[PDB]
Write a protein that binds this ligand. Structure first.
Ligand SMILES: *[C@H]1O[C@H](CO)[C@H](O)[C@H](O)[C@H]1O
Ligand SMILES: *[C@H]1O[C@H](CO)[C@H](O)[C@H](O)[C@H]1O
Ligand SMILES: *[C@H]1O[C@H](CO)[C@H](O)[C@H](O)[C@H]1O
Ligand SMILES: *[C@H]1O[C@H](CO)[C@H](O)[C@H](O)[C@H]1O
Ligand SMILES: *[C@H]1O[C@H](CO)[C@H](O)[C@H](O)[C@H]1O
Ligand SMILES: *[C@H]1O[C@H](CO)[C@H](O)[C@H](O)[C@H]1O
Ligand SMILES: *[C@H]1O[C@H](CO)[C@H](O)[C@H](O)[C@H]1O
Ligand SMILES: *[C@H]1O[C@H](CO)[C@H](O)[C@H](O)[C@H]1O
Length: 97
C-alpha cells in the first residue's frame, strides 16, 4: 500500500509507514512536516506544501477487514481396539472303558 498523507517510508520493504517527525528549527521550536502526496518519502514542512490539506481529493481507504478465525482443535482419536475374546472350553478327557 502507498504510505498515506503525512506518512513516509524510505527503506524499501518496510512493514509499517512512519509519520513525518516535527522539524526542529533550533532553539526549541518545531514546525511539523506534512507529505505532499501519497507514497512519498519526503517530509516537506506543512507551511510550504504546494497542495494544501484542503486540496486533497482522495477518498480515505476503507478500514482493515476482520482477522480470520482460529484453527479447530485436534479431532478425537478412534476408539481403542478390544481385547481377544475368551478361548472356548477345552475337551473333556475320554470316558472310561
Ligand atoms: C482520509 O485519507 C484521505 C487521503 O486518501 C484524506 O486525507 C481524507 O481527508 C482523510 O479523511
Ligand atoms: C472487509 O471490509 C473491507 C471494507 O472495510 C472490504 O470490503 C474488504 O473486501 C472486506 O473483506
Ligand atoms: C488481524 O488481521 C487484520 C487484517 O485482516 C488486522 O490486521 C488485525 O489488526 C489483525 O489482528
Ligand atoms: C474432527 O473434529 C474437529 C473439530 O472438533 C474438526 O472438525 C476436524 O476437522 C475433525 O476431523
Ligand atoms: C487405544 O487405541 C486408540 C487408537 O485406536 C488410541 O490410541 C487410544 O489412546 C488408546 O487407548
Ligand atoms: C469376544 O469378546 C471381545 C470383547 O469382550 C470382543 O467383543 C470380540 O469381538 C468377541 O469375539
Ligand atoms: C484346552 O484346549 C482349548 C482349545 O483346544 C484351549 O486352548 C484351552 O485354553 C485349553 O485349556
Ligand atoms: C464319560 O466321561 C467323559 C468325561 O469324563 C465324558 O463326559 C463322556 O461324555 C462320558 O461318556
Amino acid at each position: 500500500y502507498k504510505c498515506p498523507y503525512d506518512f513516509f517510508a524510505d527503506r524499501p520493504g518496510v512493514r509499517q509507514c512512519t509519520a513525518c517527525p516535527p522539524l526542529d528549527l533550533g532553539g526549541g521550536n518545531l514546525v511539523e512536516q506534512c507529505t505532499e502526496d501519497l507514497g512519498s518519502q519526503r517530509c516537506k514542512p506543512c507551511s510550504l506544501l504546494s497542495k494544501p490539506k484542503t486540496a486533497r481529493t482522495e477518498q480515505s481507504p476503507p478500514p482493515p477487514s476482520p482477522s480470520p478465525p482460529p484453527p479447530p482443535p485436534p479431532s478425537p482419536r478412534p476408539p481403542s481396539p478390544n481385547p481377544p475374546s475368551p478361548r472356548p472350553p477345552s475337551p473333556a478327557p475320554p470316558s472310561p472303558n
